[PDB]
Amino acid sequence: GWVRPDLGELSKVTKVKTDRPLPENPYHSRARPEPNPEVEGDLKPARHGSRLFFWTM
Amino acid sequence: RWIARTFFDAPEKNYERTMAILQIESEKAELRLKELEVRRLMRAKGDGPWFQYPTIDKALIDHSPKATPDN
């Protein structure tokens, strides 16, 4: 028997089952270092102008 | 009295103007000292939003089936 595999039968990405579920972090990775505290929220106008030596308002 | 009536200003007016400007520049001095404190501690620590020099953006870092099974 064994009909010879034609082109392109040795291609065509394929599903298959295992017994194990796929594990998290195969890269033996630590957690995230830090989040960035997001500076957000609406803005007030300029408090007392530039607050330079003068040039107030 | 004519001079005080048509030319000069009230001492209450000048007095309260001095009080108001002292309030204004007191707030300005407090905010300026707070500004330099915030800047020096933020450069020392790095938590704040200011001194973040651009590091790597991970848009091009992709997970995909490579060629070599050790990646």
- Helix %, strand %, coil % of chain A (to 5): 0, 0, 100
C-alpha angle A7-A9-A11 in degrees, rounded to nearest 5: 105
Helices (H) and strands (E) in chain B, counts: 2, 0
Q: In this structure, which long-range contacts are made by residues B44-52, counting pairs with CB atoms below 8 Å and at least 24 apart in sequence?
A: B47/A37, B48/A39, B49/A39
Solved using: cryo-EM
Answer for the pair A37, B47: CB distance below 8 angstroms, yes or no. yes
Which pair of tokens denotes residue A8?
Answer: 């392109």
Which pair of tokens denotes residue A41?
Answer: 């929220």
Nearest-by-Cβ selection for A51 from B32, B47, B48: B32
Resolution reached, in Å? 4.1
Q: Please, which residues have CB within 8 angstroms of residue B48's CB and are 6 or more apart in sequence?
A: A39, B38, B42
B50 to chain A: nearest residue by CA?
A: A39
Answer for the pair B38, B48: CB distance below 8 angstroms, yes or no. yes
Of the candidates A25, A7, A1, which has an alpha carbon nearest to the alpha carbon of residue B63? A25
Start-to-end CA distance of chain B, whole Å, equals: 96
Q: Which residue in this structure is represented by tokens 């000069």?
A: B8
Substitution target in B21, B28, B42 with the highest count of A β-carbons within 10 Å is B28
